[PDB]
Amino acid sequence: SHKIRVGDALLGRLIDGIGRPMESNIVAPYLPFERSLYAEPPDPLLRQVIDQPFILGVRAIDGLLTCGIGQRIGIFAGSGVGKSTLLGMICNGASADIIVLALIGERGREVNEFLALLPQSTLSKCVLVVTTSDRPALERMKAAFTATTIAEYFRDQGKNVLLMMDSVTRYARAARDVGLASGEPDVRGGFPPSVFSSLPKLLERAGPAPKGSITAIYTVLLESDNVNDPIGDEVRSILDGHIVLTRELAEENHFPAIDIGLSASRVMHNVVTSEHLRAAAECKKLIATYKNPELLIRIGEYTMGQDPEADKAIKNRKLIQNFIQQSTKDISSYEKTIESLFKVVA
Numbered sequence: 256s257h258k259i260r261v262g263d264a265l266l267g268r269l270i271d272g273i274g275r276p277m278e279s280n281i282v283a284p285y286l287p288f289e290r291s292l293y294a295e296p297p298d299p300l301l302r303q304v305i306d307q308p309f310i311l312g313v314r315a316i317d318g319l320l321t322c323g324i325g326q327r328i329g330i331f332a333g334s335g336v337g338k339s340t341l342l343g344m345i346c347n348g349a350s351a352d353i354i355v356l357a358l359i360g361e362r363g364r365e366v367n368e369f370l371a372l373l374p375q376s377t378l379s380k381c382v383l384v385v386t387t388s389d390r391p392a393l394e395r396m397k398a399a400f401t402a403t404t405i406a407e408y409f410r411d412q413g414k415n416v417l418l419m420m421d422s423v424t425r426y427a428r429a430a431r432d433v434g435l436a437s438g439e440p441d442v443r444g445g446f447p448p449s450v451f452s453s454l455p456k457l458l459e460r461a462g463p464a465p466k467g468s469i470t471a472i473y474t475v476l477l478e479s480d481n482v483n484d485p486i487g488d489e490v491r492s493i494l495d496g497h498i499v500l501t502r503e504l505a506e507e508n509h510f511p512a513i514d515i516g517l518s519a520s521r522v523m524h525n526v527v528t529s530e531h532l533r534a535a536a537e538c539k540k541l542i543a544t545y546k547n548p549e550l551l552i553r554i555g556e557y558t559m560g561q562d563p564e565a566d567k568a569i570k571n572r573k574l575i576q577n578f579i580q581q582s583t584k585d586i587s588s589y590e591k592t593i594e595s596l597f598k599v600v601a
């Protein structure tokens with residue numbers, strides 16, 4: 256009841272919503288420790304500051320929206336915009352000692368499609384908390400806490416942990432159904448009070464620590480409708496950074512489909528050099544100001560301003576696009592990413 260068993264043997268394993276290994280082995284993993292699913296957690300005694308970069312191995316993010324160790328980061332994405340591919344790139348590229356994944360509320364098919372993106376070397380440092388759509392709501396809700404608790408266990412060993420929860424949206428729908436079942440009323444958008452109060456309690460467990468850390472990425476699944484998602488809204492107000500993927504970029508075959516102007520890192524200025532910050536700011540402005548040259552040629556115009564800002568954007572388009580667009584096998588170290596950024600704004 257509300258305790259799970261943990262240990263190093265969790266690494267490389269598929270684990271259910273309450274922490275039980277799901278692969279059938281004749282020899283069971285050794286999991287000698289019990290931990291509560293809930294933590295007080297790390298009392299502000301004392302609370303830390305985010306001041307070191309957390310490298311994802313994604314040029315657009317590392318370059319223009321740099322993450323920090325112990326940050327809480329949201330990725331907001333609808334269907335068919337390459338979310339799972341981006342999550343895969345992050346797991347394979349991130350500077351994390353241990354990855355704890357919570358895969359909540361999707362069908363087995365989607366789980367296997369994600370797992371296929373992770374090579375043996377990545378899986379070997381992963382704990383995979385998986386609760387598919389068919390599982391009871393209680394199990395899908397608990398998966399978020401199980402994952403968080405396991406991340407804390409590994410943090411406590413001095414590991415820099417990446418907690419990746421796909422998705423807080425489906426966690427919340429599970430927690431909704433549990434809450435309503437207990438007799439809570441709908442307060443906003445079909446959600447009872449319990450789900451809202453759980454969000455900061457979960458997110459506040461990520462963060463830097465004396466030894467080790469937990470940097471957390473939470474996905475928010477966007478519906479192709481105009482219905483308010485109050486869970487996503489509350490998350491927006493808590494996060495330290497947010498990455499937004501758009502259908503508009505996905506349909507241009509622009510991947511990762513990150514809209515830079517809608518994305519932000521509240522910690523970047525604290526974890527990158529002033530020169531890095533300056534180059535990123537120019538790159539962002541160049542991205543925002545760019546306009547298809549076709550549009551001027553078709554009206555016979557010899558523009559070229561003299562409009563300095565717009566002229567550089569066209570001149571630097573291919574460089575900028577090759578920088579922010581990045582294939583799965585298009586690998587880039589943090590050193591290389593920064594060197595490449597300076598090149599695209601030159």
Ligand SMILES: [Ca+2]
Nearest residue numbers: 483484485488
């Ligand atoms: Ca909203």
